[PDB]
Design a protein around this nucleic acid. Structure first.
Ligand SMILES: [Mg+2]
Ligand SMILES: [Mg+2]
Ligand SMILES: [Mg+2]
Ligand SMILES: [Mg+2]
Ligand SMILES: [Mg+2]
Ligand SMILES: [Mg+2]
Ligand SMILES: [Mg+2]
Ligand SMILES: [Mg+2]
Ligand SMILES: [Mg+2]
Ligand SMILES: [Mg+2]
Ligand SMILES: [Mg+2]
Ligand SMILES: [Mg+2]
Ligand SMILES: [Mg+2]
Ligand SMILES: [Mg+2]
Ligand SMILES: [Mg+2]
Ligand SMILES: [Mg+2]
Ligand SMILES: [Mg+2]
Ligand SMILES: [Mg+2]
Ligand SMILES: [Mg+2]
Ligand SMILES: [Mg+2]
Ligand SMILES: [Mg+2]
Ligand SMILES: [Mg+2]
Ligand SMILES: [Mg+2]
Ligand SMILES: [Mg+2]
Ligand SMILES: [Mg+2]
Ligand SMILES: [Mg+2]
Ligand SMILES: [Mg+2]
Ligand SMILES: [Mg+2]
Ligand SMILES: [Mg+2]
Ligand SMILES: [Mg+2]
Ligand SMILES: [Mg+2]
Ligand SMILES: [Mg+2]
Ligand SMILES: [Mg+2]
Ligand SMILES: [Mg+2]
Ligand SMILES: [Mg+2]
Ligand SMILES: [Mg+2]
Ligand SMILES: [Mg+2]
Ligand SMILES: [Mg+2]
Ligand SMILES: [Mg+2]
Ligand SMILES: [Mg+2]
Ligand SMILES: [Mg+2]
Ligand SMILES: [Mg+2]
Ligand SMILES: [Mg+2]
Ligand SMILES: [Mg+2]
Ligand SMILES: [Mg+2]
Ligand SMILES: [Mg+2]
Ligand SMILES: [Mg+2]
Ligand SMILES: [Mg+2]
Ligand SMILES: [Mg+2]
Ligand SMILES: [Mg+2]
Ligand SMILES: [Mg+2]
Ligand SMILES: [Mg+2]
Ligand SMILES: [Mg+2]
Ligand SMILES: [Mg+2]
Ligand SMILES: [Mg+2]
Ligand SMILES: [Mg+2]
Ligand SMILES: [Mg+2]
Ligand SMILES: [Mg+2]
Ligand SMILES: [Mg+2]
Ligand SMILES: [Mg+2]
Ligand SMILES: [Mg+2]
Ligand SMILES: [Mg+2]
Ligand SMILES: [Mg+2]
Ligand SMILES: [Mg+2]
Ligand SMILES: [Mg+2]
Ligand SMILES: [Mg+2]
Ligand SMILES: [Mg+2]
Ligand SMILES: [Mg+2]
Ligand SMILES: [Mg+2]
Ligand SMILES: [Mg+2]
Ligand SMILES: [Mg+2]
Ligand SMILES: [Mg+2]
Ligand SMILES: [Mg+2]
Ligand SMILES: [Mg+2]
Ligand SMILES: [Mg+2]
Ligand SMILES: [Mg+2]
Ligand SMILES: [Mg+2]
Ligand SMILES: [Mg+2]
Ligand SMILES: [Mg+2]
Ligand SMILES: [Mg+2]
Ligand SMILES: [Mg+2]
Ligand SMILES: [Mg+2]
Ligand SMILES: [Mg+2]
Ligand SMILES: [Mg+2]
Ligand SMILES: [Mg+2]
Ligand SMILES: [Mg+2]
Ligand SMILES: [Mg+2]
Ligand SMILES: [Mg+2]
Ligand SMILES: [Mg+2]
Ligand SMILES: [Mg+2]
Ligand SMILES: [Mg+2]
Ligand SMILES: [Mg+2]
Ligand SMILES: [Mg+2]
Ligand SMILES: [Mg+2]
Ligand SMILES: [Mg+2]
Ligand SMILES: [Mg+2]
Ligand SMILES: [Mg+2]
Ligand SMILES: [Mg+2]
Ligand SMILES: [Mg+2]
Ligand SMILES: [Mg+2]
Ligand SMILES: [Mg+2]
Ligand SMILES: [Mg+2]
Ligand SMILES: [Mg+2]
Ligand SMILES: [Mg+2]
Ligand SMILES: [Mg+2]
Ligand SMILES: [Mg+2]
Ligand SMILES: [Mg+2]
Ligand SMILES: [Mg+2]
Ligand SMILES: [Mg+2]
Ligand SMILES: [Mg+2]
Ligand SMILES: [Mg+2]
Ligand SMILES: [Mg+2]
Ligand SMILES: [Mg+2]
Ligand SMILES: [Mg+2]
Ligand SMILES: [Mg+2]
Ligand SMILES: [Mg+2]
Ligand SMILES: [Mg+2]
Ligand SMILES: [Mg+2]
Ligand SMILES: [Mg+2]
Ligand SMILES: [Mg+2]
Ligand SMILES: [Mg+2]
Ligand SMILES: [Mg+2]
Ligand SMILES: [Mg+2]
Ligand SMILES: [Mg+2]
Ligand SMILES: [Mg+2]
Ligand SMILES: [Mg+2]
Ligand SMILES: [Mg+2]
Ligand SMILES: [Mg+2]
Ligand SMILES: [Mg+2]
Ligand SMILES: [Mg+2]
Ligand SMILES: [Mg+2]
Ligand SMILES: [Mg+2]
Ligand SMILES: [Mg+2]
Ligand SMILES: [Mg+2]
Ligand SMILES: [Mg+2]
Ligand SMILES: [Mg+2]
Ligand SMILES: [Mg+2]
Ligand SMILES: [Mg+2]
Ligand SMILES: [Mg+2]
Ligand SMILES: [Mg+2]
Ligand SMILES: [Mg+2]
Ligand SMILES: [Mg+2]
Ligand SMILES: [Mg+2]
Ligand SMILES: [Mg+2]
Ligand SMILES: [Mg+2]
Ligand SMILES: [Mg+2]
Ligand SMILES: [Mg+2]
Ligand SMILES: [Mg+2]
Ligand SMILES: [Mg+2]
Ligand SMILES: [Mg+2]
Ligand SMILES: [Mg+2]
Ligand SMILES: [Mg+2]
Ligand SMILES: [Mg+2]
Ligand SMILES: [Mg+2]
Ligand SMILES: [Mg+2]
Ligand SMILES: [Mg+2]
Ligand SMILES: [Mg+2]
Ligand SMILES: [Mg+2]
Ligand SMILES: [Mg+2]
Ligand SMILES: [Mg+2]
Ligand SMILES: [Mg+2]
Ligand SMILES: [Mg+2]
Ligand SMILES: [Mg+2]
Ligand SMILES: [Mg+2]
Ligand SMILES: [Mg+2]
Ligand SMILES: [Mg+2]
Ligand SMILES: [Mg+2]
Ligand SMILES: [Mg+2]
Ligand SMILES: [Mg+2]
Ligand SMILES: [Mg+2]
Ligand SMILES: [Mg+2]
Ligand SMILES: [Mg+2]
Ligand SMILES: [Mg+2]
Ligand SMILES: [Mg+2]
Ligand SMILES: [Mg+2]
Ligand SMILES: [Mg+2]
Ligand SMILES: [Zn+2]
Lengths: 131, 204, 118, 122, 59, 14
RNA sequence: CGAUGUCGGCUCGUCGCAUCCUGGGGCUGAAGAAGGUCCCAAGGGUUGGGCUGUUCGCCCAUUAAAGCGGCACGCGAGCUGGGUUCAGAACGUCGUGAGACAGUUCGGUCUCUAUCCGCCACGGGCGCAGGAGGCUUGAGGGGGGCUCUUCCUAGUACGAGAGGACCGGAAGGGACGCACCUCUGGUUUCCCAGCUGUCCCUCCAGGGGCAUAAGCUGGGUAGCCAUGUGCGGAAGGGAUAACCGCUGAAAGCAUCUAAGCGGGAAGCCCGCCCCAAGAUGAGGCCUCCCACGGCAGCCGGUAAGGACCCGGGAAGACCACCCGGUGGAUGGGCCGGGGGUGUAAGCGCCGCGAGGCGUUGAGCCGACCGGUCCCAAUCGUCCGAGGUCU
RNA sequence: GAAUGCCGGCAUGAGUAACGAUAAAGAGGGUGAGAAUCCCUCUCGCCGUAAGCCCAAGGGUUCCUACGCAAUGGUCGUCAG
RNA sequence: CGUGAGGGAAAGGUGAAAAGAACCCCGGGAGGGGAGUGAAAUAGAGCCUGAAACCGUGGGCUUACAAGCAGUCACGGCCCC
């Protein structure tokens, strides 16, 4: 028996497939379905994804934004049904896979280290020239 | 009171009513009944289930004659289920519906020789302020001349784990009968690959 | 506990074990066959198999990769020129370990041979 | 994850700026406060002329923390500090406003005044 | 510690009772198919160097 | 054995 | 007195009950709420801090509560050594002095190896009248046993008002326990990358050693893990404690009692989880071999089976346990996936150059999920029933 | 028959602690009755204000070579102060 | 052993005679087994006698549901005379 296969099989009914690929260093907006007793609305969250940890269906990505003077990070299940959509706001170029370091960095200092990834921005426009 | 033998497949989590539900996947069915226990013949009730088919190349003659008395292809393991007596000759996941609550017994992971701290959550000793080679030590183990002995059952170091453990009141999250899979919320004893028993719960 | 853990320690620290394996690799690749203790033999098997396999790839990048462990341009040339080609169709399993019958006198250790196969 | 001796930044305009937790009001022997729990604390640093002053033993609700908070939906949220809002015995903000994001956990815990006063509810 | 010490001398009966688990177990031996010599299983035969049906080393 | 190791000092029972 | 280590602390508990809390009650100067006082009850629980060597005590902040005691004032062949309790030195005080002090002050060597009982674990042996492979009954043990807030009932009963229920029904916590690794968060001794100095290979480029038993730094899978997740306390049946009764004489009345019956506790029995037939009182059920050869015995050759040897294992100190041994996927390799890293080398272009860009999510790549006989589990060996008697 | 007696011998603890710096090893060849331990070669690691070299004190043949391995060497030894 | 003054041991015996074991066998040697010497060789040089503790091999009785200052009293069983 293939225990790995069965596990993927349970996961498949929840596996999401409508979300743009992104990377650490990218700026990104997550439209997230949140409940606020007793209604549910769409709260946006826009920041740099500084971490993406992979475990198949269990992959989760961590997004950092500065909010009214206080740095906030949130983790999302990449296959959560609570994510309305993900809008790519900026493709930045990182040299490592985890950007924890940006936490102790000033604003302009982060600007320097994560310069725009022209190569994936040219792709961003290449596609979307569609039929 | 219904039971079934299984194999712990692994853990994952699903989503249900916008909630993360940590689940353990058990490959339960199908379990051929091999022998029924009757009060007439044995004094109690039970069904001896069979699980995981086995190469006859390895099944000896005393057991081949045992399986034969049931018309069952040789299987790898047999375990009884007290006070359970189904109607067919086969027991599958279909005896469990979602929302039900189960009791899962498995063989716990084997820590081997385990220190007093890991096994019994003893606080050990200090790591500075003069402690002399006692940082992971049990301390005292008795009194003085009265009683001049150590209690039976005194908690000490020794083998920990690899024992039968049962977890109570586990919710059944889904049943996937075509792949013979049981989704149970929470954690089950022991390692992936290890044998488990899934019973109806004794709680209410 | 040691659960699901790969890799013997061989009572050496992180750099000694490695030098041990690299030296065992050179000697086996050099002489074709050697005698070690049984445990060291079993660990050499994969350590050498990988190198023999990288040699079958032939590319320059593989040669440099191998020279990190073997360091001998000559013997790496022997690896790529005479050893590698006799395995072109062998999908792994480039070495074998057979136990010997008698132990050492001075510490009783069980011995075995590691050899490149045919 | 706040415990006695933990310093918290003060998130309102009570006049306090720093407080040092001296107790977690959550039963007999609670070990840690998270977002939404109440603590007794001592004001260790406050600006002049504030309704609270250094030494006062005030109450407080923790609005944001450094250890991440987990959520039934499987997500989490983590702040750059531990912050608190000074409250009264009726669990009402003594201050006239709240500075910064606050944890959504505060809403379903009956800290509705602080959640409105908050610029962002994350 | 405080230097534990044998309180009494161990009797001949108790000394030897402890050695009740000290006998050597004789070596596991099987005849070699080629030269019919007794040798431990799963080792190359040290009297003819034959294993798995073929000559593997000089003796 | 012309050298005798000096005895340890007693625990002070005062 | 040919030595029984002395305070406090730490660690580990265990018992008592004259009960701090939680449960059950009677009386009340008990309207309700909340108290008082006594009775029953030892199942569980009984917090974190400031000061002092302290025990003790006071104080802060909580709590359901922050109980008192025994065990050599429990526990130094378990730790500590701040105090006491040697030799130094100083103060106050006494003494002509040497010196003295339940007066003070600063400092002042705490012994690797467990034989016997006891204890935690784990085997070896024999036994359980034939020999074996399985699955089990549970005698008897052990574990567990805590509790709070809010809300509905209901601002109702009670109350001038303030205040505010019983019973019944929900929800949410703290601490503890068992298991787990999907998530969160650790580690991950060589899984990847970057960096310095030096020596080297091979001059460039590319690399290797060493700088720790990882040179340093940024990461980091499996595993082991808590800070993370699941779940447990019960329910329910039974017998009672105090206490409250029914019916009822002795004793025309009365009386819970003398005949008889009911109610009644977190406690007792059972229930739950775990060990468990050496339970020598050695239990049961299913299946397998079977009347062997030679003088309740002996020696043989076997049967069913077993062990040895081997490849291994989230099993493990050894042993044991579990899987596998060519009719075989057990380990190693190889291949695919997952995962980590984060765009190798080489070449081309750009820049005087450090570099940059492309080829390229490339190259490398432990353990995870699988595939594949390429390599090793070759070949074998030794034990192992013939069934006592009424 | 005892004097923690005296001298000698032999037990127990026990196949137990230990085998004296965690700078570190592997292979191949040779010798020999015998080899992890001796010789040879390659590979690897350690020291390098030394763990390298030269004096003085002290030691007194320990130097060199051949033949040896009972004891000495904390194992082994064909090697050795 | 102690710088020194000084302290201060242990250790006797083959046999009448070396007749002290040629030679052969296993073995690297040590040791042994034969042969031989001797009245005698468990008088063989690790030598007269050769006690005891202590260690071992073989045989008889005995023991794995049993509580012990180890003996004693009784009865029974088995082995021996
Ligand atoms: Mg089981
Ligand atoms: Mg534990
Ligand atoms: Mg612990
Ligand atoms: Mg600790
Ligand atoms: Mg000390
Ligand atoms: Mg110690
Ligand atoms: Mg220490
Ligand atoms: Mg410990
Ligand atoms: Mg004591
Ligand atoms: Mg006693
Ligand atoms: Mg076990
Ligand atoms: Mg370890
Ligand atoms: Mg493995
Ligand atoms: Mg070691
Ligand atoms: Mg070692
Ligand atoms: Mg190193
Ligand atoms: Mg490899
Ligand atoms: Mg072999
Ligand atoms: Mg062998
Ligand atoms: Mg040797
Ligand atoms: Mg101040
Ligand atoms: Mg002040
Ligand atoms: Mg702010
Ligand atoms: Mg000690
Ligand atoms: Mg001690
Ligand atoms: Mg010590
Ligand atoms: Mg000890
Ligand atoms: Mg000692
Ligand atoms: Mg004896
Ligand atoms: Mg005796
Ligand atoms: Mg003994
Ligand atoms: Mg022993
Ligand atoms: Mg024996
Ligand atoms: Mg003396
Ligand atoms: Mg002495
Ligand atoms: Mg005394
Ligand atoms: Mg004495
Ligand atoms: Mg005495
Ligand atoms: Mg004494
Ligand atoms: Mg006590
Ligand atoms: Mg009482
Ligand atoms: Mg009470
Ligand atoms: Mg009460
Ligand atoms: Mg009242
Ligand atoms: Mg009362
Ligand atoms: Mg109690
Ligand atoms: Mg108690
Ligand atoms: Mg206290
Ligand atoms: Mg204190
Ligand atoms: Mg202080
Ligand atoms: Mg303090
Ligand atoms: Mg105190
Ligand atoms: Mg005091
Ligand atoms: Mg109260
Ligand atoms: Mg005491
Ligand atoms: Mg005490
Ligand atoms: Mg004490
Ligand atoms: Mg001590
Ligand atoms: Mg003490
Ligand atoms: Mg003691
Ligand atoms: Mg003592
Ligand atoms: Mg002191
Ligand atoms: Mg001190
Ligand atoms: Mg004076
Ligand atoms: Mg005077
Ligand atoms: Mg004094
Ligand atoms: Mg006094
Ligand atoms: Mg003073
Ligand atoms: Mg000092
Ligand atoms: Mg002092
Ligand atoms: Mg001593
Ligand atoms: Mg012992
Ligand atoms: Mg003993
Ligand atoms: Mg005793
Ligand atoms: Mg046993
Ligand atoms: Mg039986
Ligand atoms: Mg029972
Ligand atoms: Mg018993
Ligand atoms: Mg109301
Ligand atoms: Mg009214
Ligand atoms: Mg109620
Ligand atoms: Mg993890
Ligand atoms: Mg995982
Ligand atoms: Mg993680
Ligand atoms: Mg590597
Ligand atoms: Mg390195
Ligand atoms: Mg370098
Ligand atoms: Mg260069
Ligand atoms: Mg070097
Ligand atoms: Mg160096
Ligand atoms: Mg690291
Ligand atoms: Mg990390
Ligand atoms: Mg990991
Ligand atoms: Mg009743
Ligand atoms: Mg009445
Ligand atoms: Mg009446
Ligand atoms: Mg009556
Ligand atoms: Mg009744
Ligand atoms: Mg209860
Ligand atoms: Mg059982
Ligand atoms: Mg039995
Ligand atoms: Mg049983
Ligand atoms: Mg009994
Ligand atoms: Mg093993
Ligand atoms: Mg087998
Ligand atoms: Mg076989
Ligand atoms: Mg395989
Ligand atoms: Mg494989
Ligand atoms: Mg792979
Ligand atoms: Mg791969
Ligand atoms: Mg991949
Ligand atoms: Mg990837
Ligand atoms: Mg590039
Ligand atoms: Mg490139
Ligand atoms: Mg380049
Ligand atoms: Mg150019
Ligand atoms: Mg990749
Ligand atoms: Mg196939
Ligand atoms: Mg054979
Ligand atoms: Mg006398
Ligand atoms: Mg005497
Ligand atoms: Mg004495
Ligand atoms: Mg003597
Ligand atoms: Mg003796
Ligand atoms: Mg001795
Ligand atoms: Mg001895
Ligand atoms: Mg041993
Ligand atoms: Mg011992
Ligand atoms: Mg030991
Ligand atoms: Mg020692
Ligand atoms: Mg040892
Ligand atoms: Mg040492
Ligand atoms: Mg040494
Ligand atoms: Mg050493
Ligand atoms: Mg080093
Ligand atoms: Mg080598
Ligand atoms: Mg060699
Ligand atoms: Mg040697
Ligand atoms: Mg030798
Ligand atoms: Mg040499
Ligand atoms: Mg230099
Ligand atoms: Mg230097
Ligand atoms: Mg001279
Ligand atoms: Mg001299
Ligand atoms: Mg020579
Ligand atoms: Mg010698
Ligand atoms: Mg020698
Ligand atoms: Mg010799
Ligand atoms: Mg000589
Ligand atoms: Mg020697
Ligand atoms: Mg020697
Ligand atoms: Mg030595
Ligand atoms: Mg020689
Ligand atoms: Mg010399
Ligand atoms: Mg001298
Ligand atoms: Mg002299
Ligand atoms: Mg004479
Ligand atoms: Mg004479
Ligand atoms: Mg004569
Ligand atoms: Mg003469
Ligand atoms: Mg000869
Ligand atoms: Mg001779
Ligand atoms: Mg002989
Ligand atoms: Mg002779
Ligand atoms: Mg005569
Ligand atoms: Mg004689
Ligand atoms: Mg004589
Ligand atoms: Mg004479
Ligand atoms: Mg004699
Ligand atoms: Mg003699
Ligand atoms: Mg004699
Ligand atoms: Mg005997
Ligand atoms: Mg009995
Ligand atoms: Mg008997
Ligand atoms: Mg007695
Ligand atoms: Mg009688
Ligand atoms: Zn042969």
């Amino acid at each position: 028996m293939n225990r790995g296969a069965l596990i993927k099989l349970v996961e498949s009914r929840y596996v999401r497939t409508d979300l743009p690929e992104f990377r650490p260093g990218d700026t990104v907006r997550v439209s997230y379905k949140v409940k606020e007793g007793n209604r549910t609305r769409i709260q946006d969250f826009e920041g740099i994804v500084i971490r993406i940890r992979r475990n198949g269906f269990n992959t989760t990505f961590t997004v950092r934004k500065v909010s009214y003077g206080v740095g906030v990070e949130r983790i999302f299940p990449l296959h959560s049904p609570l994510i309305q959509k993900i809008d790519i706001v900026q493709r930045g170029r990182a040299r490592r896979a985890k950007l924890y370091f940006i936490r102790n960095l000033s604003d302009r200092e982060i600007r320097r280290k994560l310069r725009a990834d022209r190569k994936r921005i040219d792709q961003d426009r290449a596609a979307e020239r569609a039929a | 009171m219904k039971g079934i033998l299984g194999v712990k497949v692994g853990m994952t989590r699903i989503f249900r009513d916008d909630r993360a539900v940590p689940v353990t996947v058990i490959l339960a069915g199908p379990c051929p009944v091999v022998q029924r226990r009757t009060p007439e013949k044995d004094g109690y009730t039970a069904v001896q289930l069979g699980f995981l088919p086995q190469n006859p190349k390895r099944v000896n003659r005393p057991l081949k004659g045992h399986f034969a008395k049931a018309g069952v292809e040789p299987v790898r393991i047999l375990r009884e289920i007290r006070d359970f007596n189904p109607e067919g000759d086969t027991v599958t996941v279909e005896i469990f519906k979602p929302g039900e609550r189960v009791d899962v017994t498995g063989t716990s992971k084997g820590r081997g020789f385990a220190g007093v701290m890991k096994r019994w959550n003893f606080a050990g000793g200090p790591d500075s302020h003069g402690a002399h080679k006692i940082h992971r030590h049990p301390g005292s183990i008795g009194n003085r001349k009265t009683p001049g002995r150590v209690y039976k059952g005194k908690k000490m170091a020794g083998h920990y784990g690899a024992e039968r453990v049962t977890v109570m009141n586990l919710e059944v999250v889904d049943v996937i009968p075509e792949e013979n899979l049981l989704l149970v919320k929470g954690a089950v004893p022991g390692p992936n690959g290890g044998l488990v028993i899934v019973r109806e719960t004794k709680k209410a | 506990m040691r659960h699901l853990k790969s890799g013997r320690k061989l009572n050496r620290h992180s750099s000694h074990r490695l030098a041990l394996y690299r030296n065992q690799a050179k000697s086996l690749l050099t002489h074709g066959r050697i005698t070690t203790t049984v445990p060291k033999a079993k660990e050499l098997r994969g350590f050498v198999d990988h190198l023999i396999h990288l040699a079958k790839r032939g590319d320059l990048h593989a040669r440099r990769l191998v020279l990190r462990d073997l360091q001998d341009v000559k013997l790496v040339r022997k690896l790529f020129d005479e050893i590698a080609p006799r395995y072109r169709d062998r999908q792994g399993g480039y070495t074998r370990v057979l136990k010997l019958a008698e132990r050492r006198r001075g510490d009783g250790a069980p011995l075995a041979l590691v050899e490149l196969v045919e | 994850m706040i415990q006695p001796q933990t310093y918290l930044e003060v998130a309102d305009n009570t006049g306090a700026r720093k407080i040092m937790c001296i107790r977690v009001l959550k039963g007999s022997n609670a070990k840690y406060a998270t977002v939404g729990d109440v603590i007794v604390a001592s004001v260790k640093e406050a600006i002049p002329r504030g309704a609270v002053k250094e030494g006062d033993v005030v109450k407080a609700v923790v609005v944001r923390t450094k250890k991440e908070i987990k959520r039934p939906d499987g997500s989490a949220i983590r702040f750059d500090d531990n912050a608190a809002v000074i409250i009264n015995n009726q669990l009402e903000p003594r201050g006239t406003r709240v500075f910064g994001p606050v944890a959504r956990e505060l809403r379903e815990k009956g800290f509705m005044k602080i959640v409105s006063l908050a610029p962002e509810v994350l | 510690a405080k230097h534990p010490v044998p309180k009494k001398k161990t009797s001949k009966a108790r000394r030897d009772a402890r050695r009740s688990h000290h006998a050597l177990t004789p070596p596991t031996l099987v005849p070699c198919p080629e030269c019919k010599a007794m040798k431990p299983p799963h080792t190359v035969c040290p009297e003819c160097g034959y294993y798995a049906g073929r000559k593997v080393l000089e003796v | 054995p012309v050298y005798i190791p000096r005895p340890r000092p007693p625990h002070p029972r005062l």
